[PDB]
Amino acid sequence: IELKPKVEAFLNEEIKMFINGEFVSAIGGKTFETYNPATEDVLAVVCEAQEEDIDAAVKAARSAFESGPWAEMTTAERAHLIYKLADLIEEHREELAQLEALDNGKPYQVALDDDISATVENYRYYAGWTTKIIGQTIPISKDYLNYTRHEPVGVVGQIIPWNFPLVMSSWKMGAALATGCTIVLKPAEQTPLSLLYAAKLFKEAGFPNGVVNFVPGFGPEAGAAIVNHHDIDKVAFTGSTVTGKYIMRQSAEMIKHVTLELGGKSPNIILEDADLEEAINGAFQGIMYNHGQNCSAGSRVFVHRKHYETVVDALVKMANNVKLGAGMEKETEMGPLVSKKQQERVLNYIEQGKKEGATVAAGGERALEKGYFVKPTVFTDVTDDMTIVKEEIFGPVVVVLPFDSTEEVIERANNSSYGLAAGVWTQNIKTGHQVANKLKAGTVWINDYNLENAAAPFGGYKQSGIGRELGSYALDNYTEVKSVWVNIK
Amino acid sequence: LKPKVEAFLNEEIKMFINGEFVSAIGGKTFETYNPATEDVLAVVCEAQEEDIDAAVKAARSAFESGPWAEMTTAERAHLIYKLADLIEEHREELAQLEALDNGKPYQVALDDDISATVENYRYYAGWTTKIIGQTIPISKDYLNYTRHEPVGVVGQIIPWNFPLVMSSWKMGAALATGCTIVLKPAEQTPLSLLYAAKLFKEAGFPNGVVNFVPGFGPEAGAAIVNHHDIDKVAFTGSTVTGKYIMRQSAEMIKHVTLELGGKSPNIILEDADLEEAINGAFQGIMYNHGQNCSAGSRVFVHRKHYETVVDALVKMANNVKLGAGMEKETEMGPLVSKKQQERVLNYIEQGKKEGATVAAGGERALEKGYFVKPTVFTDVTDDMTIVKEEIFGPVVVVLPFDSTEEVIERANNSSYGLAAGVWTQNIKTGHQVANKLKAGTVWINDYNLENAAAPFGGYKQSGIGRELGSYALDNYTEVKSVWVNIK
Amino acid sequence: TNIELKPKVEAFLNEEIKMFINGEFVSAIGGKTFETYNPATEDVLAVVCEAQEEDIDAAVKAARSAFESGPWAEMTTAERAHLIYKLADLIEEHREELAQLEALDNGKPYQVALDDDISATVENYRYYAGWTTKIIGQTIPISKDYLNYTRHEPVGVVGQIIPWNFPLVMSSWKMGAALATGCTIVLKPAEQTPLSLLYAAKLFKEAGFPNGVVNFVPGFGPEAGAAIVNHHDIDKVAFTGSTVTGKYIMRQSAEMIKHVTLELGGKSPNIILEDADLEEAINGAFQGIMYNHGQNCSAGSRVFVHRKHYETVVDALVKMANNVKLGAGMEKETEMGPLVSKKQQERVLNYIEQGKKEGATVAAGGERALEKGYFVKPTVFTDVTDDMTIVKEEIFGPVVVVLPFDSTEEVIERANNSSYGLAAGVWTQNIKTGHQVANKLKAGTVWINDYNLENAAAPFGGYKQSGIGRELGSYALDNYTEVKSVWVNIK
Amino acid sequence: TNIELKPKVEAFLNEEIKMFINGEFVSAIGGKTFETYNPATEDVLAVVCEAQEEDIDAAVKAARSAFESGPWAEMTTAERAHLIYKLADLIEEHREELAQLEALDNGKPYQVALDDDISATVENYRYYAGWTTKIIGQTIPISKDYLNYTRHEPVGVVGQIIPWNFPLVMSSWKMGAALATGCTIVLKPAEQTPLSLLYAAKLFKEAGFPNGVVNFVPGFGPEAGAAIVNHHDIDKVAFTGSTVTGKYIMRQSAEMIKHVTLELGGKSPNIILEDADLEEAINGAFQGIMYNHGQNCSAGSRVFVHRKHYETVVDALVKMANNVKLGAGMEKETEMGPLVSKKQQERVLNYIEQGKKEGATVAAGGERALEKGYFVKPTVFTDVTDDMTIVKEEIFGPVVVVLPFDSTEEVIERANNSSYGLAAGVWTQNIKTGHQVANKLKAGTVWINDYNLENAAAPFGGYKQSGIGRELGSYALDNYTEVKSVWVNIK
Ligand code: NA
Ligand code: NA
Ligand code: NA
Ligand code: NA
C-alpha cells in the first residue's frame, strides 16, 4: 500500500502539538520518537509536551470555556461544529487509517473499516446530543419551581491509550464536547500521529481556539501534569488497572470526578446448545481481534465438556493459520504488538504459563525477522489460579477451559477482579438471558462478540472501571447537576 | 421521656447484624453523651474490624441469595413503604432520641428530621418499580438493551449533624435499587439509627439486607472503606476525611459518592425584599446551630443595605433562646461535643486576632453543655481564615459588595460549592446569578430547602455525585449493555 | 359448599346503592334506580341509584371545583402520594369484601377475584402513588439567552368509562394514572357491575380524598355514558369497551378537540411454533382463552399451531375444556363462572351457531350449561379458515379457534391480518426466533413463552383498531397531562 | 429596489410543476393542473399538477412499500440519520432559492423567509437527525422471572397536511419527527403554496432518500386532503390548519381508530403587567401580532395592558402600525407583505367590518392598501369588549385588539376565557409573578418577556380547541410511535 501524499507530507516534518488553535512545538523544544512496530524504524519525531505545555493547554481550555465563541454559541451551532468534524474525518479516512496502521501496527483495511468509520459515527452520534442534554422540572409543591441544569464541568483532562488510538480519542471527546466542555487530551507515546493529524481537521471544521488541545508525551511528565493540574475540573482515563488506581488516588486531593476504563479478563462461554460453527469463529475473533490488544478480549474461552476437544482443535488450526505481516501489507491479517516492551511482556506471560503447568497447543513464541510480533497462542490444560488465567496479557493469547454445568461456569466467569465484558453462546432463549443476567460484566453479547456502537454504553464492573463511555450514559460524566429552587411565594 | 426510649436507654446499645441485635464480638463498648448536660446517655456496643467483616458477610449473603434477591420490585417497594410507616408511628421516640443524642430542639427534630426521613423512604419506595434501563435502536440485526443492576454490598458512613435523615439519604436510594447495606453512624450520635433497626426487623426486611455498625472512624470506618468485599462506598462528613476515603477506594476501583463541607454564599442584591432576605440569611446560618454543610456562612449584602442587615442579624443573634433540646422553649441547642465547641470557639479567637470584629456572640453560653452564642462577624476580608474555612457552628460573616459581577466572583472564589442563595425580586437577574454560581443547589429567594425529589450535592471540593432525586439511584447502579444477535 | 357472605357486604347489599359525588353518598336527583344481577342465579343482587345527565353535570361541577381550588389543588406531591397509598392499604384491608362483590356482581370465581383482581388493583394504586412525586418535565438547553422548560400539567376534569369484565382493576387502570398527575375524576362503571366500585367509594372517603376529586356515577350508556362523552366542561376522556362504541366516543370528542384514550378489543393470536416446550404452550393456549370465561379483550382466541403439533394440541384443548368445573363464583369448587349477562350469553351462543353454519366443527362445548345462570361451555373450534366470522370477529366468550400453519412467515402474515392488534403470544425455545417473531407481530403486548400477563409498570394497549394510547406504566401518565413549554428571556 | 430572481428558481418556474411519488417526478394520472399565484401582483406564478384521489393511492402504495421492505426498512439508524442530515445540508445550500419561492408564492418578505423560515427548517432537520439514534424504549424491572422491554416502533405510513402560512418549516415540523422514527410519508402542501416543497423534493432525491419514503401531493382539501384523511392504509394522520377542519379530520379518523395530531388556531393573549419593561413589551406586543402579517396561529391578537400603561401602548402601537412598509416580498424595502389570497383578504376585511358594526374603534388601518395585491393595513382596534366577535375569533391578519385591565387575577380570568389556548405572553420584571402567571395560563407555550419564539428542541401545541398533541422537541416523536411491550418468560 503506498503512502498517501498527505501522510508523506505530514511525516516529512516534525510533528507538532496543538494548543490554543495553533500547531506548535514544545516551549523548551524537547522531542521524542514514535516507531512503526512492523520494522522497528523511526516513523516520526514528535514534539514532547512538558509540565509547562500542559499548563499552556489548560489556560487555553479555561479561557475558551469562559469567554469566547464556545461559551456563547447555541447548542445547535455546537452540534454543527461536531458534525463538520466527522465529515472531515470521513474525507481523510485513507490518511487516518494509514497513520493508524503505521504507528500502532494494525492492518490498514481494518483501521479503515472499523476504527475510522467508528470514530466518524461516534461524532455524528454525539453531535445530536448537544441539543438534547436535558434536565428536570420537578413537581414538589405549588410554592416553588424546581429545576435542574446539567452544566458542563469545564476543562477536562483526558488520557487514552495506544490500542485503538483515534477511536479512543472520540470516546472521550464526543461526549465531553457535546456537554460543552473544554479539552486537554494526551495520546499514548506509542501512537500520537492519528490524533495530531486529526488536529488540522478540528481547525478546519471551525473549532474556536483552545476548545481542544492535544499533547503528546510520556506519563511521568505530561500525564502526571494532567492528573495533578489544579485548574482541571474532571479527569478521564483508559489504560491498565494499575494506573487507574494512581489516577484515582491523585484525583482525591481535589475531590475531582473520575471516569476509568480499564483491563479485563473477559469470558466467552460456549454452552452445550450453542451453534458451534458461529461460536468457534466468535471465540477466535474474540481474542485475536486487534492482536488481543483490547481490554475486552475474550481471553478465557469456556467450553462445555461435550465440545471442548472440538473447539480446542478448531482454535489451534485457526491460530496457526493467521497471517502475520506489516499493517500496510495488503494480505496481512494480524500485525505486531505495539512496542518492544509489550512483546517482552506478553512473551513473558507465555513463559509464566509454561512453567506453572499449562501447555502450549499453538504459537507460544515470537515470529518473523523483525518487528514486535507474537504468534497467536492457545493455552490448554489450565487452572483457575494460574497467572495466565487471572491476569490481562494484552496479546493474542487465549486460554481454553472445560466446564460441566451452567452454575459452575457462571461462578468461574465471575471469579475475577475484572468485569468488563462477556460472551455467551446458546440457542436457548431462556438460558441466554439467564446467563447474561447473572454475569458480572458491563457488556454482554448473546451469540456474538466484540461489538461496540456509539449508542450502547461500555464500561466495567469491579476493577474493570468506574463509569461508562458511549451512549447517553457517557454524557453524565461531563456534567455537573445544579438544582435550582425558585420561591414563588 | 417516652416509655419505649426509656426501655431502650436502660440496657447497653446493641449493633444490628444479619437481622439480629448483637454485641461486639470482642465485647468493647463506647459512650455517647447528651450535649446539654455532658452526661453519658448510653453505653453502646463498639464495632471492631471483625464486626464489619461479619456485617459484610451477612450483606453479601442477603444480596446473592434469598428473599431480597428473589423479591419482585413491588414486594421490595412494600417493605420500604412499611418502614416509612413504622418510622412515622415512632416519630416521638426518634425525635427525643435525636434531641438527646445530637442536641437539637425536640420540635424541629420532630417537624423536620423525622418527617423528612419518612418522606425520603416513601419517595424511594416509589422508585423500586421505576428504575428502568433502555432499549436502543441501532440495527435490525440486534436487540440492544441496558439493565440498571444493583452494585451489591454498599458501605455507608454518615455524620452526626442530621443523624436519622442521613441514614435515609443513604439507604433509601441504595435499598430501592436492590442493594444490600453496611452502615456506620457517627460515634457522637449512634442512638436514633440503632433504635430504628427495630423497625427494619418489624417491617420484614430479610436478614442481612441492612447492618448497623456503630463505633469509631479509624476502626469501623476504615474497615468499611478498606474492605475487599464492599462494592461501592458513600460518605458524608469533612473534606479532609473525604480525601482519605477516595484515596483508599482507589486501591479497588471502588465508586465513591461524597457529600462534604461548604462555605456557601447567601447573596442579598439591591432589589431583594429585604425583610424576607434578612430572615433567610439568619436561618441560613443558624439553623441546626450552624452544624450544616450547606449553611450560608458567607452573607454578601449590597452596600446600600449592609448596615441594615448587620443590625438585624445582631438583634436576632442575641434573641436566640439557648437551652437543652428537651426543653420546650429552646430555639438552639448546644454543639454536639466538647471537641466541636473547642473548635468553633477557637475559630472565633482566630477571627478576632486576624482583625475581624464580633458584632454579636463570640463566646460560650450557660453553665454546662457545649454551647456557643450565635455569632456575627463584621469587618472581614476574603483573605481571612474565618471566611475561607468551614467553622461548622452558629457563626456568620457579613460582607459588603458593590456590583453583581464582583459578588459572583467572590462567591465562586472558593474550593467549596455545595450551595448558594440569591435574593432579588428581578426575574432575569435571579436566573443569571443562579446560572453563574458554582454550586450544587441554588435557592432564589429562599434558603436551606431539601426534598427527596430534588438532587443535592457539591461542585469542586464539596463533593462527588448527588444524593436525593432520581440522580441518586445512579450511584447505586451498575449499567449492563446486552446485545442479542437476532440476525 | 358456598363461600359465606361477608358481614360488610350484606350490610351494603341491604340498602339501595348510592352514587358518590362531591364526597357524599347520594341518590340520583331524579330518584331513578336500576337493577344489577347475580349472573350465576339471575336474581336481583342490588338496587342502584341511576345517574342521569343532571347527575353527571353535578359530578363535573364537583370535579371542576376540586381541581381549580381547595386541598387537592394545594397539596404537595408527597401529600397526594400518601392519599393514593392509603387508598391501596384500605383496598387490601377490604380485600374479601371486594372479591365477593366481584364474584357476585360480575360472576367470576371468588378466589381468582381475590388473588388476581383485588391484588392487581392494590398494586396498581401503589405503583402510581409512586409516580406522583416523579412526573417530570424538561430543561432544554437551546441558547444562553433563555431558560427553556416544560411543565407536565394535569389536563383537569377527566371523563372515564370502564367495562364490566374486570370491574375494580379496570377502575384502577383509569384512576391511578390520572390521580397521580393531579387530575380530577368523573367515573362511570358498567351497568352490569357497579358494586365493586361503589363499595370502594367508602375507602376513598376513609383515605381522606378531598371532595369532588373522584366521582362515581353508575348507570346506562345512552344517558350517563353519553352525558360524559358530550360534557362541554370535561377536558379529556378515556374509554374501554366495544370497538363500535370507541368510534362514537372518538367522533363526539372531535367537536371539542378533546384528547381520547381507547382500549378496545382483539383477536389476539397465540402461536405455537415447532420448537415450543409443548406442555407449557398447551397450558398457555388453554389459559390464554379460558381465563375470565374468555371475557378478556386480549384473550388469545386464535391459537395457531404448527402442523406437527396441531392434533396433539386439539386433543388436549378438548379434554381440558370438558374438564372445567362450571358453577357459581361463590361456590368453592368453581373454576369458571357464567357470562355476565343474558345479552352476552345470547351473543356468544350465536357466534357459535354462525361457527357451525359456516362449516367449522365444534370439537367441544358449543352450548349453554346448567339449569340457571348465564353459563356457556368452554368451546373448541376446529376445521376453521381465516375468512370465517368466528376467526375474524371478537366473540368475548370461552370460545377458541385452532388453526394449523406450515411456516413462520405464513403464521406472522395470518396473525397480522386483522383489524385488531391488542396482544400476541409466541411459544418457541429459540433465542432468535422468539424476538424476531415478537418484532414482526403487530400487537401492543407480546408474550414469549407466556400469555395474559399484566403489571402496573408495563404499558398495555392496541395497535390498529384495538385502540389509541396506552395504559399502565409511565406511558399512561402522558394521557393525563398537558405539556407546557415556558421560555424565560434572561436577556 | 427588486431582488433578482435566482436562476435555479427561474428554471423551476419555467415549467409545469410536478408532484413527487416513489422517488420520481410525475404528473397527475388524470393530467389535471391548478394554479398558484403571487399574492403581491395577483398574476399566475405557476401551474402545478393537481393530485386526485387516484394519486393518493399511488403515493400510499409507494410509502407502504418503502416502509415494509427495501433500504428504508433495512437501514441502520446511523444511516437514516445520515440521510436526514444530508437533506439539511442541501436545503441550506439552496437557502436563497427556497426563500425566494416562499416570498413569491406565500407573499412574505425574502429576508425574513431566509433568516427565519429556511434557517429554522434546516435546524429542525438537523435536530431530528440527531434523534434517530436516540429513540429509546425501556427495560422495566418487574420480577426475576421475566425480562420486560418496550420498543418504540414507527407507526408506518403517515398522512400529513400542512398550511400556507409557513410552508417549508411546517413541512419540516411534520417530516423531521416522523422520519426520525422511521416512518414513511405522504404530505399535501396547501393549494396556495406548493412551490417550496416541490422544489425541496429535488433535495430529497439528491440526499439519497429511498423511493417512496417521502411523497408530495399537491392539490385541494376536498380531493387530495380528503383522500389522505379517508385512506384505509394510512396508519396515522397529522394536521395543521383550521379548527374547523381539525374537527372533520378527527371525525373521519374515528372510523379507523387512527391516531390524530392537531395543531389548530388560537387567539393568544399577550399581557403587559404594571411592572414590565415597557420598552421591550411594546415591541413584543407589536411584533407578536404583526410577524408574518398576522398569519400565525400563535399571534398575540389580544394585547392586554395594565390600565396605567394602556394609553402609552395604544399610542405606540398606532404609531408603529402606520409606519409598516407594505410592499412585495421580493422588494427590499418591504417590512410586510400581502395576505395570501383574495379569499383571505376578504375574510380579514370582513372581520374588520364586523368590528366596527359591534362598536369597536379603528385607531389605525382597517382597510385595504396599495393598488394591486392582497394587502391589508396593519390594524389596531380599541374600545373593545370580551364578548365581541373580533376579540373572540381568529381573524388571521395583521389585526390587534388592545384591552385594558386592572388586576392580575382579572387578566388571567380573561386570557383563559377562551376556547383557544395555543400560546401566551407575559411581561413583568418580577421573578415571582413571572412564573406564577405562566403557571396559571392555559396555553401550550408561555413566553415570559418575549413572544413568537419557536425552536426545534421546544414543544409546541395547544390546550383546549387549539389542538391535540405536540410538535417539536422530544415530544413529537411519540405521535409517530407505537409502543410494544415484550415480556420474555425466563422461567
Ligand atoms: Na508508533
Ligand atoms: Na450523643
Ligand atoms: Na351484576
Ligand atoms: Na401562491
The DSSP annotation for D150-176 comes to EEEEE--EEEEE--SSSHHHHHHHHHH
How far lies A354's CA from each of A346, A426, B288, in Å?
A: 13, 32, 66
User: Residue D288 has which C-alpha cell?
Assistant: 407578536
End-to-end CA distance of chain B: 70
Q: Counting beta carbons within 10 angstroms of the beta carbon of residue C156, is it exposed (0 to 12), middle (13 to 18) or buried (19 or more)? A: buried
With CB atoms and an 8 Å threshold, state whether A128 touches D134: yes
With CB atoms and an 8 Å threshold, state whether D141 touches B132: yes
Asked if residue C187 lies in contact with residue C197, where contact means CB atoms within 8 angstroms, the answer is yes
B204 lies in the same domain as B220: yes
With CB atoms and an 8 Å threshold, state whether D141 touches B135: no
What are the residues whose beta carbon lies below 5 Å from ligand 3 (ion)?
A: C 36-37, 105, 192
CA–CA dist B2, D310 (Å, integer): 66
C242 lies in the same domain as C296: no
Question: Which residues on adjacent β-strands are paired with residue A184?
Answer: A157, A213
What's the gap in Å between the CA of C71 and the closest CA on chain B?
19
CA nearest to A162, candidates A339, A352, A395, A409: A339
Strand B180-184 to D33-37 pairing: unpaired
Interface contacts A/B by beta carbons within 8 Å: 158
Which chain C residues are Cβ-neighbours of D287 within 8 angstroms?
Answer: none
- Residue carrying the nine cell digits 460453527: A277
CA–CA dist C109, C290 (Å, integer): 13
Residue D311 parent element (H or E): helix D310-323
Helix, coil or strand: residue D185 = strand
CA–CA dist B78, A345 (Å, integer): 54
Question: Which residues on adjacent β-strands are paired with residue A15?
Answer: A46
Contacts of A91 (CB under 8 A, 6+ apart): none
The phi, psi pair for C222, rounded to 5°, reads -65, -20
How many other CB atoms sit within 10 Å of the CB of residue B26? Answer: 12
CA–CA dist D209, A365 (Å, integer): 53
Question: Looking at the 3D structure of chain D, how many domains does it have?
Answer: 2
Question: Which residues on adjacent β-strands are paired with residue C305?
Answer: C272, C404
With CB atoms and an 8 Å threshold, state whether D133 touches A455: yes
Q: Which of A147, A431, A486 to mutate to test the interface with C (most CBs of C within 10 A)?
A: A147
User: Residue D390 has which C-alpha cell?
Assistant: 373580533
Asked if residue C269 lies in contact with residue C425, where contact means CB atoms within 8 angstroms, the answer is yes
CA–CA dist B438, B416 (Å, integer): 9
User: Residue C452 has which C-alpha cell?
Assistant: 395474559
**DSSP summary character for residue B381:** -
Residue B64 parent element (H or E): helix B49-64
Asked if residue B9 lies in contact with residue B41, where contact means CB atoms within 8 angstroms, the answer is yes
B429 lies in the same domain as B456: no
Sign of CA dihedral A414, A415, A421, A424: negative
B159 lies in the same domain as B304: no
Q: Return the HEC string of chain C.
A: CECCCCHHHHHHHCCCECEEECCEEECCCCCCEEEEECCCCCCEEEEEECCCHHHHHHHHHHHHHHHHCCHHHHCCHHHHHHHHHHHHHHHHHCHHHHHHHHHHHCCCCHHHHHHHHHHHHHHHHHHHHCCCCCCCEEECCCCCCEEEEEEEEECCEEEEECCCCCHHHHHHHHHHHHHHHCCEEEEECCCCCCHHHHHHHHHHHHHCCCCCCEEECCCCHHHHHHHHHHCCCCCEEEEECCHHHHHHHHHHHHHHCCCEEEECCCCCEEEECCCCCHHHHHHHHHHHHHHHHHCCCCCCCEEEEECCCHHHHHHHHHHHHHHCCECCCCECCCCECCCCCHHHHHHHHHHHHHHHHCCCEEEECCCECCCCCCCECCEEEECCCCCCHHHHCCCCCCEEEEEEECCHHHHHHHHHCCCCCCEEEEECCEHHHHHHHHHHCCCCEEEECCCCCCCCCCCECCCHHHEECCECCCHHHHHHEEEEEEEEECC
- Residue carrying the nine cell digits 362483590: C101
Q: Is D297 tagged catalytic?
A: yes
- Residue carrying the nine cell digits 516529512: A12
What's the gap in Å between the CA of A488 and the closest CA on chain D?
5
CA–CA dist D175, D169 (Å, integer): 10
Find how far residue D327's CA is from the centre of its chain.
23
Contacts of D155 (CB under 8 A, 6+ apart): D181, D183, D235, D236, D259, D480, D481, D482
End-to-end CA distance of chain C: 78
Asked if residue C321 lies in contact with residue C289, where contact means CB atoms within 8 angstroms, the answer is no
Which chain C residues are Cβ-neighbours of D138 within 8 angstroms?
Answer: 474
Asked if residue A205 lies in contact with residue A81, where contact means CB atoms within 8 angstroms, the answer is yes
- Residue carrying the nine cell digits 346448567: C370
CA–CA dist C38, C329 (Å, integer): 10
Q: Which of C134, C136, C147 sits opposite B126 (nearest CB)?
A: C134
For B204-226, b/e burial (b = at least 16 CB within 10 A) is ebbbbbbbbbbbebebbbbbbbb
B478 lies in the same domain as B395: no
Give the largest Cα separation in chain A, rounded.
81
**DSSP summary character for residue B131:** -
User: Residue C28 has which C-alpha cell?
Assistant: 340520583
CA nearest to D66, candidates D173, D174, D186, D177: D186
| Last residue before each break in chain B (C–N > 2.5 Å) | none
Question: Which residues on adjacent β-strands are paired with residue B42?
Answer: B32
Residue type at A477? N
CA–CA dist D343, D164 (Å, integer): 13
User: Residue D24 has which C-alpha cell?
Assistant: 420520481
CA–CA dist A226, A192 (Å, integer): 17
Residue type at A437? N
Q: Nominal resolution in Å?
A: 2.6
Classify residue A113 as left (phi > 0), alpha (psi -120 to 50) or beta: alpha
Q: Which of A74, A137, A427 sits opposite C138 (nearest CB)?
A: A137
Sign of CA dihedral C115, C121, C127, C130: negative
Contacts of C114 (CB under 8 A, 6+ apart): C95, C96, C99
CA–CA dist C8, A471 (Å, integer): 56
Radius of gyration of chain C (CA): 23
Distance A293 CA to ligand 1 centre (A): 14
The torsion angle over the Cα atoms of residues B353, B354, B355 and B361, rounded to 10 degrees, is: -60
Distance D39 CA to ligand 4 centre (A): 6
Chains that touch C (3 or more CB pairs under 8 A): A, B, D
| Last residue before each break in chain C (C–N > 2.5 Å) | none
B361 lies in the same domain as B462: no
Q: Which of C69, C183, C484 to mutate to test the interface with D (most CBs of D within 10 A)?
A: C484
How far lies C322's CA from each of B263, C288, C291, C356, in Å?
A: 78, 16, 15, 19
What's the gap in Å between the CA of B412 and the closest CA on chain D?
23
- Residue carrying the nine cell digits 482515563: A237
C169 lies in the same domain as C284: no
Q: Is A295 tagged catalytic?
A: yes
B312 lies in the same domain as B325: yes
CA–CA dist C473, C303 (Å, integer): 28
The phi, psi pair for D228, rounded to 5°, reads -70, -45
The phi, psi pair for D82, rounded to 5°, reads -65, -35
Asked if residue D408 lies in contact with residue D430, where contact means CB atoms within 8 angstroms, the answer is no
D229 lies in the same domain as D279: no
Find how far residue B337's CA is from the centre of its chain.
17
Q: Counting beta carbons within 10 angstroms of the beta carbon of residue C6, is it exposed (0 to 12), middle (13 to 18) or buried (19 or more)? A: middle
C246 lies in the same domain as C307: no
Distance D162 CA to ligand 4 centre (A): 14
Structural domain of residue A237, as residue ranges?
1-263+454-489
- The experimental method, as deposited, was X-ray
Strand D184-188 to D214-216 pairing: parallel
D169: domain CATH number?
A: 3.40.605.10
The residue in chain D having the minimum alpha-carbon distance to the alpha carbon of residue C437 is D486
Residues B60, B65, B67: CA angle, nearest 5 degrees: 110
Q: Return the HEC string of D61-118.
A: HHHHHHHHCCHHHHCCHHHHHHHHHHHHHHHHHCHHHHHHHHHHHCCCCHHHHHHHHH
With CB atoms and an 8 Å threshold, state whether C489 touches D142: no
Residue type at B100? L
CA nearest to B469, candidates B451, B444, B487: B451
How many other CB atoms sit within 10 Å of the CB of residue A411? Answer: 12
User: Residue D481 has which C-alpha cell?
Assistant: 410511535
Question: Which residues on adjacent β-strands are paired with residue C17?
Answer: C48
Strand D481-489 to D146-154 pairing: antiparallel
CA–CA dist C383, C378 (Å, integer): 17
C78 lies in the same domain as C171: yes
CA–CA dist B404, A293 (Å, integer): 54
Catalytic residues of C, which ones? 263, 297
D258 lies in the same domain as D324: no
CA–CA dist C62, B61 (Å, integer): 54
Q: Which of B293, B390, B450, B467 is catalytic?
A: B293
